[PDB]
Design a binder for this molecule. Structure first.
Ligand code: CA
Ligand code: CL
Ligand code: MG
Length: 231
């Protein structure tokens, strides 16, 4: 049986387990992204975390947004990891709810492993669920799928169920992807370690492309809560 082990409900403020990232990382957070992250772009309104992407000139970038992680504060080995999220739509927008291995600090990416619980680009009427890792040959590996979401601007539940043998993805309880990780098959051993959680909204990058509909800015990603259950 799944029992609640951690949550952030965003009742009146951002909880104690989040660290905010700033700037453009290395080569636009490794994806040629166009936003400069700032603390100012994350706030709480009416029981939701609000991450706002803005058309705003700052530090050589023309967009600002927020990126938050639980690294060094909260991490999990296995569980049902989920969030209740409403998404804005617009060419260039790239929201995500995801996880990275704690060992990123020693083995780097993608060897640390990455679980993308939800990602979306532009105005797509679908969302994605993906893993990234370093396979048995030491090569960058990825495995993903997508599911139709009629109105991503409404709230939906995005989750993964992760155990020693598999990762399963769901939107509103509907499974749309599964990966076998049992005994570290296909060099997936890295998914047997602790992972921390991230939330962000990028603007532009390799995946969504470099055209941005600035008439959709400021754009708000609404996160009602993040919850983690374990059995
Ligand atoms: Ca809430
Ligand atoms: Cl569990
Ligand atoms: Mg709704």
């Amino acid at each position: 049986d799944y029992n609640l082990v951690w949550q952030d409900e965003f009742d009146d403020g951002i909880g104690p387990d989040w660290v905010f990232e700033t700037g453009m990382g290395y080569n636009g957070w490794g994806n040629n992204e166009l936003q400069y992250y700032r603390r100012e772009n994350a706030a709480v309104e009416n029981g939701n975390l609000v991450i706002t992407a803005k058309h705003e000139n700052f530090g050589g970038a023309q967009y600002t947004s927020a990126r938050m992680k639980t690294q060094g504060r909260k991490s999990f080995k296995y569980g049902k990891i989920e969030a209740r999220i409403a998404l804005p739509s617009g060419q260039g927008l790239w929201p995500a709810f995801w996880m990275l291995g704690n060992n990123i600090t020693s083995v780097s990416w993608p060897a640390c492993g990455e679980i993308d619980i939800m990602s979306r680009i532009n105005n797509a009427l679908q969302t994605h669920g993906t893993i990234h890792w370093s396979d048995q040959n030491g090569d960058h590996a990825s495995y993903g799928d997508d599911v139709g979401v009629s109105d991503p601007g409404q709230y939906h539940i995005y989750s993964v169920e992760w155990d020693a043998n598999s990762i399963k993805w769901f939107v509103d309880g509907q499974q749309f992807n599964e990966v076998d990780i049992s005994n570290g098959v296909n060099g997936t051993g890295e998914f047997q370690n602790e992972f921390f959680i991230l939330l962000n909204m990028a603007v532009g990058g390799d995946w969504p492309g470099f055209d941005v509909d600035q008439s959709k800015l400021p754009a708000q990603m609404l996160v009602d809560y993040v919850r983690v259950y374990q059995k």
